[PDB]
Amino acid sequence: TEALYQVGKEFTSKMDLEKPNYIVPDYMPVVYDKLPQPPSHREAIVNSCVFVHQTLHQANARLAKRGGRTMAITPRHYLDFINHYANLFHEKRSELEEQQMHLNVGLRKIKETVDQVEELRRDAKVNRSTALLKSLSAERERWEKTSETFKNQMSTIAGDCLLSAAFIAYAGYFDQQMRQNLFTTWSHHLQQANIQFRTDIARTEYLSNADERLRWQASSLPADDLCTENAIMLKRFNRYPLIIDPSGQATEFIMNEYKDRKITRTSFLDDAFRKNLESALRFGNPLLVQDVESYDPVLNP
Amino acid sequence: MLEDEDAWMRTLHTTASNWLHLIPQTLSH
Amino acid sequence: FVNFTVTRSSLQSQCLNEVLKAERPDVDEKRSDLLKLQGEFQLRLRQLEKSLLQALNEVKGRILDDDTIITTLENLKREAAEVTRKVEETDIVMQEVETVSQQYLPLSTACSSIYFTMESLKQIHFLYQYSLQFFLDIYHNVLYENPNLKGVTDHTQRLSIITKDLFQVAFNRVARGMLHQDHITFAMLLARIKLKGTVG
Amino acid sequence: QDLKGVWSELSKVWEQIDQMKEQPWVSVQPRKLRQNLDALLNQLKSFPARLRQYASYEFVQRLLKGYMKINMLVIELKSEALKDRHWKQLMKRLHVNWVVSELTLGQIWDVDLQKNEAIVKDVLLVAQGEMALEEFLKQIREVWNTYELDLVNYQNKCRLIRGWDDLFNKVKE
């Protein structure tokens, strides 16, 4: 627990996870017995980040208990989770700041247009300027409230990214039911720690714009919640992905998506696999390798 | 139970226990 | 890892979504609209502000060409209030879709059980192999091309007819490709599935 | 009168920084540069507390900290991947008319590499890809210029070629 806590703190130290108004909960659940007390927002966030790893280990152990096929959980999962959390936090904060700045520019231009129509009222066009102003000011007021909402969105970003970052890193092999169970457990633990997060989060919607979903559906993506989440996992991956697709739809989806990049098909069983892999690594074209059940170890580095 | 995957091992434990109890422990040569 | 594997819950969700789309499309709209109160609607609402600001400073005293620029400002007046209504009506809609979706849930569980039984049929005879496209085609026939639903408008009767036709069409389609010995076995499996799904 | 003290104690650091800046770009070894910069920073850390309050000391310490931060990009700029074309691309994109033979470390240092890290990363990525392709063509040229057809005697009548499988495998690859 201490190693996970320390490797989390020094990777999420560059992030602005500071909240001066963080009300510490009366009774907090702790994985790191030596947490600073009373914990601050950064301390609580890192403790929750370790809760994600601990709960995932417990879930895998439970799946082993009921005879299900388990998958190894290693420190690299935690490093990938923290990297995804950092990239997602930076991306969402950058997007919100860009939107808020654009809305401030819009308010400036609305005030400029109000000045222009006031100049035009100095001059039967003049009477109806009373209507356009009645519209413009209303729009201005609307934009003002929109700006206020953005502030609340800031207060909700951090935990939300956590609940998404873990989802991108850990719960990729699990089925939909256990994915939802893990997400509910993480959300409950975040609620227990007074970390502010959206109540009704949609993972597939928080991590992808509708243009991307439309593009995926244009490709051979079966449109389901699990399939959309998987398609997101094929976009926000730090480590290369392993696609378990008995149907075979996902291979066609990857092929159609990366056709512009001239992706080429290969399999481990193929005799000319190593040379094709050498060419792909040497020149940079993307590659899809099939039949990884007979995984060659040469791909380890 | 190939379609049903919910407890299968809970019953299989009792079944295997009964099967062990039924068979004699050894056969003298 | 990225698992594109069909399971009980995945197929249950797919079937429930299909039923909500086919038989209660209003709830499907109110559900797709509940996941569009996230980035989609607000992104469009401010993407319209982008075009507004593009055509707001294009002025040299010609803003009042007819004093009818408000139309461009009215196109954003409507949607905002609309996306302010749905944000206000986001708890009534959520409870409503929950209540309406739980009604159509036993059908989804029956669908998952039936498909997984068809997948289980392999170890009874080597010929008894059926793809998920088979079950989904059975469901498309049962929901859209069902002659028994014509003239029925009450939703409860439609649901009951859909369930009965699902069991019947599944048995007919599967048993047309089975030896006569195994028809009773599959019928017994479907009867057990309905007994799990039947009420009372 | 403490202004004279801080200026006198900072003068030596300025001479060393300028002497490093005057070094021609070809002779730069980034590891030695890091060693010299670390020596300068440790020397700066030993000044009396009275001098440290001044803005000049903070400015110089921040300057050396920035040079240390961009030392990574300086290492990447000494990559053998970069060629005349890539230097031309850097000059055009950064709007600087450098002369490669006459370039000095100071000119790269005072150019805002920290702000313009994206351009530098893009150019060195293109350089890495082009270096990969170039070395692959070099491998082809060396292999086929050095490949000899093996010959084995056959009944003392002639020597037939041996190794068809290897030759065809190499040609196919």
XYZ file of C-alpha atoms in Angstrom:
703
model
C 0.000 0.000 0.000
C 2.814 2.425 0.854
C 4.576 1.813 -2.467
C 1.353 2.456 -4.405
C 0.681 5.589 -2.338
C 4.175 6.997 -2.890
C 4.338 6.157 -6.600
C 0.915 7.782 -6.934
C 1.806 10.981 -5.085
C 4.969 11.682 -7.097
C 3.185 11.044 -10.425
C 0.108 13.187 -9.607
C 2.058 16.006 -7.904
C 2.146 18.151 -11.075
C -1.672 18.068 -11.133
C -3.727 20.792 -9.434
C -5.700 18.479 -7.139
C -5.853 21.160 -4.417
C -9.233 22.222 -2.996
C -9.129 24.698 -0.078
C -12.740 23.830 0.912
C -12.327 20.028 1.060
C -14.475 19.034 4.042
C -12.777 15.930 5.449
C -15.358 13.183 6.111
C -16.134 12.295 9.724
C -15.169 8.658 9.069
C -12.960 7.962 6.032
C -12.000 4.509 4.691
C -8.204 4.157 4.439
C -5.912 1.746 2.608
C -2.739 3.627 3.729
C -2.726 3.528 7.538
C -0.026 6.260 7.594
C -2.011 8.824 5.584
C -1.453 12.435 6.676
C -4.280 13.366 9.076
C -6.524 15.333 8.590
C -6.031 14.389 4.907
C -6.067 17.109 2.244
C -7.653 16.810 -1.203
C -4.460 15.532 -2.849
C -3.949 12.972 -0.073
C -7.555 11.767 -0.352
C -7.352 11.556 -4.155
C -4.166 9.476 -4.032
C -5.663 7.242 -1.328
C -8.671 6.693 -3.611
C -6.273 5.962 -6.496
C -4.796 3.186 -4.330
C -8.323 2.030 -3.423
C -8.822 1.405 -7.146
C -5.886 -1.025 -7.259
C -6.848 -2.726 -3.995
C -10.489 -3.198 -5.052
C -9.391 -4.542 -8.447
C -7.141 -7.102 -6.750
C -10.040 -8.098 -4.472
C -12.363 -8.392 -7.482
C -9.910 -10.615 -9.355
C -9.533 -12.779 -6.247
C -13.331 -13.057 -5.985
C -13.557 -14.032 -9.675
C -10.950 -16.723 -8.988
C -13.069 -17.869 -6.021
C -16.140 -18.447 -8.242
C -14.078 -20.328 -10.872
C -13.998 -17.533 -13.451
C -10.995 -16.872 -15.695
C -8.776 -14.355 -13.893
C -6.111 -12.049 -15.342
C -2.853 -11.003 -13.689
C -2.834 -7.576 -11.983
C 0.626 -5.984 -11.829
C 2.170 -2.627 -10.904
C 2.189 -1.591 -14.587
C -1.610 -1.502 -14.374
C -1.254 1.092 -11.589
C 1.289 3.114 -13.567
C -0.971 3.052 -16.638
C -3.927 4.087 -14.462
C -2.010 7.043 -13.016
C -0.766 8.076 -16.469
C -4.318 7.950 -17.843
C -5.582 9.922 -14.841
C -2.974 12.627 -15.430
C -3.556 12.854 -19.189
C -7.340 12.880 -18.736
C -7.198 15.513 -15.982
C -5.009 17.748 -18.152
C -7.214 17.219 -21.223
C -10.505 17.921 -19.459
C -9.158 20.961 -17.599
C -7.703 22.307 -20.867
C -11.030 21.779 -22.644
C -12.997 23.534 -19.903
C -10.544 26.445 -19.808
C -10.772 26.772 -23.607
C -14.574 26.825 -23.442
C -14.617 29.367 -20.596
C -12.158 31.624 -22.437
C -14.248 31.393 -25.619
C -17.388 32.299 -23.660
C -15.596 35.296 -22.113
C -14.620 36.379 -25.644
C -18.261 35.954 -26.630
C -19.409 38.144 -23.739
C -16.900 40.792 -24.867
C -18.300 40.657 -28.413
C -21.889 40.793 -27.091
C -21.034 43.957 -25.161
C -19.417 45.322 -28.350
C -22.613 44.594 -30.313
C -24.652 46.259 -27.546
C -22.427 49.326 -27.985
C -22.920 49.198 -31.775
C -26.731 49.041 -31.522
C -26.641 51.823 -28.904
C -24.706 53.895 -31.471
C -27.381 53.005 -34.049
C -30.093 54.149 -31.585
C -28.423 57.591 -31.523
C -29.866 57.996 -35.058
C -38.443 53.025 -39.099
C -35.413 50.826 -38.343
C -34.685 52.570 -35.008
C -37.819 51.360 -33.188
C -37.130 47.631 -33.751
C -33.608 48.031 -32.286
C -35.510 47.877 -28.968
C -36.302 44.227 -29.884
C -32.787 43.155 -30.953
C -31.359 44.617 -27.737
C -34.087 42.743 -25.835
C -32.680 39.616 -27.508
C -28.974 40.496 -27.162
C -29.056 41.283 -23.428
C -30.981 38.052 -22.793
C -28.311 36.102 -24.690
C -25.684 37.913 -22.617
C -27.446 36.892 -19.396
C -27.696 33.327 -20.698
C -23.974 33.203 -21.446
C -23.247 34.581 -17.974
C -25.104 31.702 -16.316
C -23.293 29.298 -18.643
C -19.990 30.671 -17.321
C -21.204 30.052 -13.758
C -21.940 26.414 -14.607
C -18.372 25.962 -15.857
C -17.096 26.787 -12.360
C -19.188 23.952 -10.906
C -17.801 21.687 -13.641
C -14.293 22.495 -12.349
C -15.330 21.337 -8.857
C -16.479 18.010 -10.357
C -13.631 17.294 -12.807
C -11.070 15.536 -10.601
C -13.061 12.616 -9.229
C -14.801 12.199 -12.568
C -11.479 11.747 -14.352
C -10.465 9.233 -11.678
C -13.611 7.162 -12.228
C -12.909 7.268 -15.963
C -9.136 6.772 -15.752
C -9.458 3.551 -13.766
C -12.080 2.379 -16.252
C -9.674 2.941 -19.142
C -6.843 1.146 -17.338
C -8.228 -1.681 -15.225
C -11.693 -2.913 -16.224
C -10.958 -3.772 -19.837
C -11.007 -7.573 -19.590
C -14.054 -7.846 -17.328
C -17.627 -8.367 -18.492
C -20.210 -5.564 -18.503
C -21.780 -6.622 -15.201
C -18.484 -6.685 -13.306
C -17.432 -3.461 -15.047
C -20.557 -1.789 -13.632
C -20.024 -3.428 -10.226
C -16.448 -2.117 -10.029
C -17.579 1.339 -11.170
C -20.274 1.426 -8.479
C -17.748 0.346 -5.845
C -15.303 3.065 -6.925
C -18.083 5.680 -7.013
C -19.239 4.664 -3.525
C -15.682 4.900 -2.185
C -15.260 8.336 -3.788
C -18.562 9.435 -2.237
C -17.344 8.140 1.142
C -14.226 10.349 0.870
C -16.239 13.541 0.050
C -14.536 13.743 -3.361
C -16.906 15.647 -5.660
C -17.901 13.684 -8.769
C -20.856 13.665 -11.168
C -23.687 11.493 -9.870
C -24.936 10.078 -13.198
C -21.681 9.626 -15.099
C -21.773 8.000 -18.522
C -18.304 6.600 -19.204
C -18.845 6.148 -22.959
C -20.135 9.730 -23.199
C -17.608 11.437 -20.904
C -14.641 10.032 -22.873
C -15.761 10.485 -26.487
C -17.437 13.133 -28.642
C -20.382 12.137 -30.796
C -18.396 12.745 -33.980
C -16.014 9.969 -32.918
C -18.905 7.633 -32.056
C -20.515 8.373 -35.419
C -17.195 7.606 -37.109
C -16.894 4.315 -35.216
C -20.467 3.319 -36.134
C -19.617 4.230 -39.743
C -16.870 1.652 -39.312
C -17.861 -1.917 -38.386
C -18.655 -1.185 -34.745
C -21.647 -3.052 -33.297
C -23.413 -0.233 -31.457
C -23.642 -1.426 -27.843
C -22.600 0.085 -24.514
C -19.909 -2.584 -24.034
C -18.726 -2.210 -27.639
C -18.587 1.590 -27.373
C -16.589 1.352 -24.135
C -14.232 -1.111 -25.838
C -13.864 1.232 -28.824
C -12.917 4.010 -26.397
C -10.334 1.679 -24.863
C -8.844 1.307 -28.376
C -8.457 5.128 -28.535
C -7.140 6.141 -25.080
C -4.660 3.281 -24.626
C -1.129 3.891 -23.401
C -0.123 0.217 -23.703
C -0.939 -1.670 -26.878
C -4.285 -3.484 -26.752
C -5.334 -7.157 -26.721
C -8.703 -7.519 -28.492
C -10.595 -10.654 -27.418
C -13.243 -10.865 -30.159
C -14.796 -14.278 -30.852
C -17.210 -12.577 -33.282
C -14.393 -10.994 -35.300
C -16.138 -7.612 -35.654
C -13.400 -5.736 -33.759
C -10.648 -6.764 -36.181
C -12.678 -5.332 -39.071
C -13.340 -2.225 -36.970
C -9.609 -1.697 -36.352
C -8.911 -2.315 -40.033
C -11.502 0.202 -41.247
C -10.437 2.828 -38.696
C -6.729 2.650 -39.602
C -7.145 2.120 -43.368
C -5.892 5.686 -43.935
C -2.658 4.683 -42.138
C -2.274 1.557 -44.356
C -2.610 -1.002 -41.561
C -1.656 -4.551 -42.596
C -2.929 -7.886 -41.273
C -0.632 -10.517 -39.789
C -0.806 -13.534 -37.472
C 1.703 -15.186 -35.148
C 1.078 -18.531 -36.875
C 2.107 -17.051 -40.245
C 5.630 -17.981 -41.315
C 6.313 -14.433 -42.587
C 5.287 -12.830 -39.279
C 8.638 -11.732 -37.873
C 9.672 -9.946 -41.085
C 6.312 -8.174 -41.364
C 6.643 -7.117 -37.708
C 10.171 -5.898 -38.446
C 8.898 -3.809 -41.370
C 6.040 -2.360 -39.312
C 8.364 -1.454 -36.421
C 10.986 -0.071 -38.820
C 8.702 2.139 -40.944
C 5.910 2.993 -38.474
C 2.809 1.653 -40.234
C 0.222 0.332 -37.745
C -0.176 -3.451 -37.460
C -2.835 -5.958 -36.379
C -1.546 -9.359 -35.233
C -4.063 -12.207 -34.961
C -3.990 -15.506 -33.043
C -2.107 -14.239 -29.992
C -3.039 -17.472 -28.177
C 0.318 -18.710 -29.555
C 2.046 -15.549 -28.341
C 5.663 -15.349 -29.461
C 7.972 -13.985 -26.735
C 10.025 -11.876 -29.189
C 7.310 -9.194 -28.879
C 8.034 -8.827 -25.133
C 10.218 -5.670 -25.361
C -24.641 -25.510 -15.974
C -22.839 -24.573 -19.206
C -25.702 -22.151 -19.945
C -26.227 -21.450 -16.229
C -23.271 -19.722 -14.532
C -24.573 -18.006 -11.388
C -23.485 -22.405 -6.586
C -22.497 -25.166 -9.029
C -19.392 -25.835 -6.910
C -21.512 -25.684 -3.719
C -23.487 -28.728 -4.942
C -20.464 -30.375 -6.596
C -18.652 -30.259 -3.231
C -21.429 -32.293 -1.587
C -21.624 -34.665 -4.573
C -17.865 -35.338 -4.560
C -17.905 -35.723 -0.760
C -20.629 -38.375 -1.052
C -18.732 -40.131 -3.860
C -15.557 -40.231 -1.724
C -17.566 -41.564 1.232
C -19.131 -44.324 -0.898
C -15.896 -45.740 -2.360
C -13.854 -47.847 0.084
C -10.576 -46.193 1.121
C -8.381 -49.120 0.007
C -8.397 -52.565 -1.624
C -6.109 -55.056 0.128
C -3.799 -56.852 -2.306
C -7.279 -6.048 -22.455
C -10.383 -5.247 -24.510
C -13.058 -7.957 -24.328
C -15.527 -8.070 -27.251
C -17.231 -11.156 -25.761
C -20.996 -11.636 -25.520
C -22.166 -12.568 -22.021
C -25.456 -12.738 -20.107
C -25.561 -9.063 -19.112
C -24.288 -7.780 -22.472
C -26.993 -9.600 -24.426
C -29.583 -8.671 -21.792
C -28.736 -4.984 -22.247
C -28.721 -5.288 -26.050
C -32.131 -6.988 -26.051
C -33.629 -4.492 -23.574
C -32.412 -1.579 -25.695
C -33.845 -3.228 -28.814
C -37.256 -3.699 -27.172
C -37.327 -0.118 -25.889
C -36.458 1.082 -29.405
C -39.048 -1.095 -31.142
C -42.084 -1.001 -28.797
C -41.715 2.192 -26.703
C -39.774 4.585 -28.953
C -40.781 7.575 -26.787
C -38.823 6.094 -23.872
C -35.951 5.413 -26.280
C -35.964 9.115 -27.183
C -36.105 10.097 -23.506
C -33.194 7.709 -22.786
C -30.966 8.846 -25.679
C -31.855 12.407 -24.609
C -30.687 11.639 -21.030
C -27.216 10.652 -22.341
C -27.264 13.719 -24.643
C -27.599 16.178 -21.700
C -23.906 15.390 -21.391
C -21.532 16.897 -23.984
C -23.690 16.525 -27.120
C -26.447 19.100 -26.555
C -24.273 21.656 -24.783
C -21.567 21.230 -27.443
C -24.158 21.953 -30.136
C -25.586 24.833 -28.082
C -22.172 26.556 -27.972
C -21.254 25.494 -31.522
C -24.282 27.597 -32.493
C -22.779 30.429 -30.406
C -19.653 29.999 -32.544
C -21.650 30.742 -35.728
C -23.458 33.535 -33.857
C -20.161 35.246 -32.982
C -18.994 34.662 -36.557
C -22.090 36.569 -37.782
C -22.314 39.096 -34.896
C -19.252 41.298 -35.529
C -19.735 41.212 -39.347
C -21.150 44.711 -39.003
C -20.552 48.144 -40.534
C -23.885 49.580 -39.368
C -25.687 46.836 -41.369
C -26.800 44.871 -38.290
C -30.270 46.405 -38.872
C -30.643 45.331 -42.513
C -34.262 44.571 -41.521
C -33.930 44.402 -37.694
C -34.441 40.630 -38.208
C -31.051 39.287 -37.036
C -33.072 38.071 -33.990
C -33.908 34.955 -36.051
C -30.261 33.872 -35.728
C -30.574 34.899 -32.063
C -33.965 33.127 -31.813
C -32.591 29.826 -33.130
C -30.408 29.837 -29.988
C -33.281 31.155 -27.829
C -35.307 27.992 -28.409
C -32.686 25.278 -27.919
C -31.277 26.792 -24.736
C -34.696 26.771 -23.041
C -35.259 23.282 -24.442
C -31.917 22.063 -23.050
C -32.811 23.951 -19.863
C -36.147 22.095 -19.659
C -34.575 18.645 -20.061
C -31.897 19.467 -17.486
C -34.734 20.358 -15.109
C -36.677 17.256 -16.239
C -33.741 14.878 -15.671
C -35.050 13.186 -12.490
C -38.613 12.581 -13.740
C -37.232 11.145 -16.986
C -34.697 8.944 -15.174
C -37.355 7.493 -12.848
C -39.734 7.052 -15.787
C -37.208 5.140 -17.920
C -36.283 3.011 -14.893
C -39.931 2.085 -14.244
C -40.643 1.408 -17.923
C -37.407 -0.576 -18.442
C -37.994 -2.882 -15.467
C -41.315 -3.856 -17.080
C -39.555 -5.123 -20.235
C -36.717 -6.801 -18.257
C -38.109 -10.365 -17.985
C -38.204 -10.464 -21.789
C -34.509 -9.508 -21.855
C -33.604 -12.226 -19.337
C -35.554 -14.769 -21.372
C -33.681 -13.637 -24.492
C -30.283 -14.080 -22.830
C -31.232 -17.503 -21.459
C -32.575 -18.653 -24.844
C -29.480 -17.544 -26.743
C -27.109 -19.159 -24.252
C -29.109 -22.377 -24.453
C -28.716 -22.259 -28.256
C -24.974 -21.816 -27.685
C -25.071 -24.760 -25.236
C -26.676 -26.940 -27.952
C -23.224 -27.716 -29.433
C -22.388 -30.452 -26.885
C -25.632 -32.358 -27.609
C -24.884 -32.846 -31.330
C -22.127 -31.472 -33.541
C -24.661 -30.058 -36.043
C -26.450 -27.987 -33.372
C -24.362 -24.854 -33.918
C -26.127 -21.484 -34.046
C -24.539 -18.036 -34.332
C -25.669 -14.981 -32.397
C -26.859 -13.667 -35.773
C -29.371 -16.537 -35.644
C -30.848 -15.359 -32.334
C -30.782 -11.707 -33.383
C -32.563 -12.562 -36.651
C -35.146 -14.510 -34.629
C -35.591 -11.394 -32.483
C -35.905 -9.086 -35.499
C -38.608 -11.420 -36.824
C -40.328 -11.515 -33.422
C -40.293 -7.723 -32.926
C -40.701 -6.157 -36.400
C -42.015 -8.889 -38.746
C -44.524 -10.414 -36.295
C -48.000 -10.711 -37.885
C -49.582 -11.392 -34.466
C -48.804 -7.829 -33.296
C -50.803 -6.163 -36.101
C -53.799 -4.247 -34.770
C -52.612 -4.448 -31.136
C -51.877 -1.079 -29.497
C -51.911 -1.841 -25.754
C -48.303 -2.319 -24.665
C -48.948 -5.129 -22.170
C -50.634 -7.272 -24.836
C -47.777 -6.490 -27.227
C -45.226 -7.563 -24.594
C -47.068 -10.820 -23.870
C -47.436 -11.577 -27.590
C -43.740 -10.789 -28.122
C -42.702 -13.164 -25.326
C -44.883 -16.011 -26.583
C -43.774 -15.477 -30.183
C -40.137 -15.346 -29.065
C -40.394 -18.774 -27.436
C -42.409 -20.193 -30.338
C -40.225 -18.844 -33.156
C -37.037 -19.806 -31.334
C -38.283 -23.376 -30.938
C -39.470 -23.582 -34.550
C -36.277 -22.157 -36.057
C -33.993 -24.317 -33.905
C -35.996 -27.553 -34.081
C -36.282 -27.380 -37.871
C -32.530 -28.158 -37.802
C -32.555 -30.828 -35.080
C -33.106 -34.577 -34.957
C -36.517 -35.632 -33.670
C -35.029 -37.080 -30.481
C -33.745 -33.692 -29.282
C -36.879 -31.617 -29.937
C -38.317 -32.568 -26.538
C -35.005 -31.735 -24.851
C -34.875 -28.191 -26.244
C -38.570 -27.721 -25.515
C -37.902 -28.768 -21.908
C -35.051 -26.246 -21.716
C -37.292 -23.446 -23.032
C -40.055 -24.480 -20.611
C -37.562 -24.254 -17.742
C -36.446 -20.827 -19.009
C -40.037 -19.595 -19.022
C -40.628 -21.114 -15.562
C -37.650 -19.080 -14.358
C -39.143 -16.038 -16.122
C -42.822 -16.629 -15.327
C -44.451 -14.619 -12.542
C -46.026 -16.160 -9.450
C 26.541 48.416 -1.123
C 25.170 44.862 -1.164
C 24.375 45.478 -4.870
C 28.148 45.538 -5.430
C 28.492 42.272 -3.483
C 25.802 40.427 -5.438
C 27.090 41.766 -8.778
C 30.696 40.789 -7.920
C 29.701 37.272 -6.800
C 27.397 36.831 -9.848
C 30.013 38.150 -12.306
C 31.959 34.856 -12.282
C 28.768 32.888 -12.965
C 28.057 35.274 -15.861
C 31.559 34.768 -17.306
C 31.184 30.984 -17.145
C 27.670 31.103 -18.656
C 28.885 33.325 -21.513
C 31.946 31.122 -22.086
C 29.608 28.135 -22.367
C 27.298 30.151 -24.674
C 30.232 31.108 -26.924
C 31.059 27.417 -27.501
C 30.430 26.372 -31.132
C 27.464 24.021 -31.494
C 29.584 21.226 -33.023
C 31.867 20.889 -29.983
C 29.024 20.751 -27.440
C 28.766 17.559 -25.363
C 25.427 17.730 -23.463
C 26.658 15.552 -20.570
C 29.595 17.909 -19.982
C 27.101 20.775 -20.297
C 24.966 19.227 -17.559
C 28.053 18.776 -15.372
C 29.040 22.438 -15.829
C 25.473 23.645 -15.218
C 25.222 21.519 -12.053
C 28.525 22.974 -10.831
C 27.165 26.480 -11.495
C 23.878 25.783 -9.672
C 25.670 24.314 -6.637
C 28.005 27.328 -6.638
C 24.974 29.658 -6.722
C 23.349 27.790 -3.806
C 26.321 28.726 -1.540
C 25.841 32.517 -1.719
C 25.125 34.458 1.505
C 21.439 34.791 2.404
C 21.656 38.598 2.080
C 22.494 38.293 -1.642
C 19.773 35.689 -2.301
C 16.969 38.211 -1.615
C 17.833 40.164 -4.785
C 15.946 39.738 -8.056
C 19.191 39.323 -10.065
C 20.150 36.154 -8.154
C 16.640 34.736 -8.666
C 16.785 35.624 -12.378
C 20.154 33.897 -12.847
C 19.081 30.835 -10.840
C 15.885 30.620 -12.924
C 17.979 30.988 -16.093
C 20.238 28.066 -15.126
C 17.153 26.062 -14.076
C 15.671 26.680 -17.539
C 18.902 25.607 -19.212
C 18.841 22.419 -17.124
C 15.193 21.842 -18.079
C 15.901 22.212 -21.826
C 19.079 20.095 -21.531
C 16.877 17.153 -22.611
C 15.989 18.901 -25.884
C 19.654 19.919 -26.211
C 20.607 16.228 -26.006
C 17.949 15.437 -28.600
C 19.323 18.218 -30.852
C 22.773 16.548 -30.857
C 21.068 13.454 -32.296
C 22.794 12.084 -35.400
C 19.284 11.705 -36.905
C 19.153 15.448 -37.640
C 20.576 16.369 -41.050
C 20.840 19.511 -43.191
C 17.173 19.139 -44.202
C 16.040 18.908 -40.563
C 18.173 21.908 -39.568
C 16.570 23.809 -42.455
C 13.132 22.728 -41.176
C 13.968 23.953 -37.654
C 15.269 27.259 -39.044
C 12.149 27.809 -41.163
C 9.627 26.844 -38.487
C 11.341 28.779 -35.665
C 12.007 31.792 -37.978
C 15.761 31.828 -37.297
C 18.531 32.173 -39.882
C 21.235 30.015 -38.313
C 24.496 28.975 -39.957
C 25.219 25.339 -39.129
C 29.011 25.645 -39.214
C 28.910 28.899 -37.199
C 26.102 27.932 -34.792
C 26.870 28.357 -31.075
C 25.227 26.897 -27.967
C 24.092 30.352 -26.852
C 21.986 30.970 -29.961
C 20.048 27.729 -29.402
C 19.845 28.478 -25.668
C 18.379 32.003 -26.056
C 15.907 30.733 -28.662
C 12.825 29.721 -26.659
C 13.204 25.959 -26.856
C 11.038 25.631 -23.720
C 8.098 27.469 -25.326
C 8.679 25.863 -28.757
C 9.118 22.266 -27.512
C 6.293 21.021 -29.767
C 8.085 22.086 -32.959
C 11.361 20.558 -31.783
C 9.595 17.303 -30.873
C 7.899 17.156 -34.276
C 11.142 17.781 -36.179
C 13.092 15.194 -34.183
C 10.256 12.669 -34.658
C 10.476 13.211 -38.424
C 14.271 12.902 -38.121
C 13.932 9.586 -36.247
C 11.616 8.173 -38.893
C 13.834 9.303 -41.768
C 16.910 7.921 -39.974
C 15.144 4.553 -39.644
C 14.387 4.468 -43.373
C 17.908 5.663 -44.263
C 19.613 2.986 -42.171
C 17.319 0.368 -43.683
C 18.434 1.427 -47.174
C 22.027 1.394 -45.887
C 21.484 -2.196 -44.720
C 20.179 -3.138 -48.175
C 23.164 -1.502 -49.879
C 25.751 -3.123 -47.608
C 24.153 -6.584 -47.742
C 23.759 -6.710 -51.516
C 27.171 -5.139 -52.170
C 28.773 -7.777 -49.886
C 26.663 -10.829 -50.845
C 28.650 -13.579 -52.564
C 27.033 -16.535 -54.311
C 28.373 -19.695 -52.676
C 29.591 -22.403 -55.061
C 30.164 -26.130 -54.445
C 31.978 -28.460 -56.839
C 29.832 -31.070 -58.616
C 31.627 -34.225 -59.866
C 34.692 -32.149 -60.851
C 32.759 -30.755 -63.853
C 31.847 -27.310 -62.463
C 30.684 -25.551 -59.290
C 26.923 -25.266 -58.779
C 25.346 -22.608 -56.573
C 24.415 -23.648 -53.043
C 22.181 -21.743 -50.631
C 19.100 -21.058 -52.763
C 16.872 -21.047 -49.677
C 18.937 -18.333 -47.966
C 19.229 -16.238 -51.142
C 15.501 -16.380 -51.892
C 14.590 -15.761 -48.239
C 16.807 -12.655 -48.164
C 15.440 -11.406 -51.497
C 11.853 -11.959 -50.339
C 12.537 -10.188 -47.028
